[model samples]
Target chain A: HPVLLKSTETGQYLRINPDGTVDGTRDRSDPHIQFQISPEG
Target chain B: HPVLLKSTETGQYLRINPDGTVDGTRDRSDPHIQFQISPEG
Candidate 1:
């Protein structure tokens, strides 16, 4: 599931799986903007 | 392949397909912000 695509501006992201969802983050406090399915890419 | 997400402020976009990947573009000159999977949807 591809999920939690976020923005540095509004702190909101387009959360997506087979379907998609939207969520908001706190602020710069959450810095892990990138994730992957690769063992190490 | 879901790849190469980026932003306008940073000239980038969110790459989310069945899978997701994150990449960065240099600027507006790169012209790699948005992509889709429909016929003008």
Candidate 2:
């Protein structure tokens, strides 16, 4: 399973825009689509 | 320039460890560093 962040209201996938600011869109890809989420070891 | 994520609460930067997990460290360098947008000097 993958951890994906999206807005339930907007229905867009979470991604960091090329401008280095956080934004969401319909597109998904490598570093832009997935996040490393976990409890620290 | 590079971007780094540091916790205001812990003074630790969010880092991508060599093992590929996210964690916090006091270091202000890679694997805590990321860059985006056009690289303008």
Task: Report per-candidate DockQ.
Answer: 0.07, 0.03
Candidate 1 global lDDT = 0.36
TM-score of chain A of each: 0.27, 0.57
TM-scores across all candidates? 0.25, 0.40
| Candidate of highest DockQ | 1
Specify the highest-lDDT model's number.
2
Query: lDDT of model 1 at residue A3?
Result: 31
**DockQ measured for candidate 2:** 0.03
How displaced is residue B15 in candidate 2, in Å?
0.5
Q: Looking at candidate 1, what is the lDDT of residue B37?
A: 23
Candidate 2 residue lDDT tens string, A1-41: 45665433334444555676555554645467566555666
Question: Can you give the lDDT of residue A17 in candidate 1?
Answer: 29
lDDT of 1 by residue, A1-41 (tens): 22334443333433332334423333323334223333433
